[PDB]
Each structure stands twice: as structure tokens, then as C-alpha cells.
């Protein structure tokens, strides 16, 4: 393994990633791999995310609307057999950044819909003076 | 009809069609969906896709190998079937903003590969004295 966690988000939540969760891993030092840094041409989305999930520890998924939207896709597509998706799997961590209706989600994305239903996720909590706890279960699922 | 033409493409991509495309079309009197910027609130982005090449008289997809990574997973997999992009259809217009080998498109984006290979698209030449050439095929499609 060459990374602690890939993280896997959409631009739509880059400033939050980019503001508390990257600097929260770093200070604890916690190596991540990104598309921005990774990603290389001649090669497909499908490869490089491929690359990324087999060096890291963990892979992180950053869920919210816009992630289903936009970055899902691939990963029903590519990824549905993965052990990274398969239920009793110690390597994913499931961040809900912002609440998803299960009925927001396209029909196509059977997986998806698989591991809402699961409730595996870490929530990111409205109130500030609970946050902390947020960082707690992260902690605790590296650390 | 309320648009002559939709527009799939990149944000990464979208200087060139801000500055070159889109201004070429307005210019002409051709109303212009796009399923972003022509925005519907209330709808996947499925149902906005769908929703603005029923509208449109022609689609145009502005393809790149940031388009293949970014944009096409949902057409493979909730568009494939459509009269759209079937073989010998008036109204598709491909153009090739950057070159696409063969081996960056992942294998399960069949019909993306089948596109590819009717070698039907017009494409953005370096060399400026080539444009309007392009230009010119541009307006043909459309009048």
C-alpha cells in the first residue's frame, strides 16, 4: 500500500474536502491519494480510480446529491462487484456530506441504493459542538 | 421546437464552447438547451439530458478525453438506446474538440466505441487556416 485513503468526491464538495477533511488527515499524518495529484492520461477514470483503491488503506466516499449525480455513475458501471462494496468489507468509509432521499437516486444505480439501505455511513452533523464526534468515528476507522 | 441545438460537454471543455461554439450558433439565430445552464430544478440529471434533446432539432457533443472521463458513463448507461445514437441519425452532430485513441475509452462504453468508429465526426483542426472548413460543415448541419 502507498496511501493511508484515496478519497473519492465530487467538485461540487471540493471546499469541503479540501478545508477540513484533507487538512484533518495530513495533520495525522495521513497519506491521500486524489485525482487531481494521481490521475494521469492514456489512461481511462476507470484506471486511475482502479490505482488509487488498491494502494490505499481506505477509500473514503464523500456522499451527497451532487456526488450521485455526477461521480456515481463509474462506480455502478465498474465497480458493483468490488470487495470494496461488498457488505462486511473493513476498508470503505462512507462520509454523508449533505442528506440524499433515497428516491433522489436513479434507479440504475442498484448498488447505491444497496449500501444507503446498509446505513453504514458517517453523517456530518449540522450542529458544530457535535462535530468532533464526526472526527472521532474518522479516527477511529483509521488511528 | 423551442431549441435548435443541445450541447453536451465538459466543464473542462467549456472555455472553447463559451467563446467559440456557443457564440458562432447564437450568432445565427439558433436557440440554444443546455442542461446545466438551460436549467430545470427538480430533475435528475437523466431527466434533464433526456428533457433537452427531445427539445432540441439537433445534439451536438462536444468530445474530448475529459468528456469520455466525465461525461459519457450516463449516456452509456441510460442513453445507449436511443434514436439518438443510432446509425444513420440526422440529428446527432459529433465533434471532436481533442483526439480520442481507442484505448482510453474503457470496454463497457460500447456505444461510445461504436460512435468512435463511424469515423463520422468533425474535427477541430490545429492549423488555423483548416478552420472554416469546419465552420462552414458547422452551419451545413444546420441549414
Redesign the interface.
Known sequence: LQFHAFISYSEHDSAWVKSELVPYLEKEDIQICLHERNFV??????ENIINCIEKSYKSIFVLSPNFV??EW??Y???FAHHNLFHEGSNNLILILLEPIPQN?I?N?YHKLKALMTQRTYLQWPKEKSKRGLFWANIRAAFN
Do not use: A, M
Not at 492520461?41 to 476507470?46: D, F, R, Y
Open positions: 492520461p492514456g489512461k481511462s477514470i476507470v449525480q455526477s455513475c463509474h455502478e458501471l465498474y433522489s436513479p440504475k
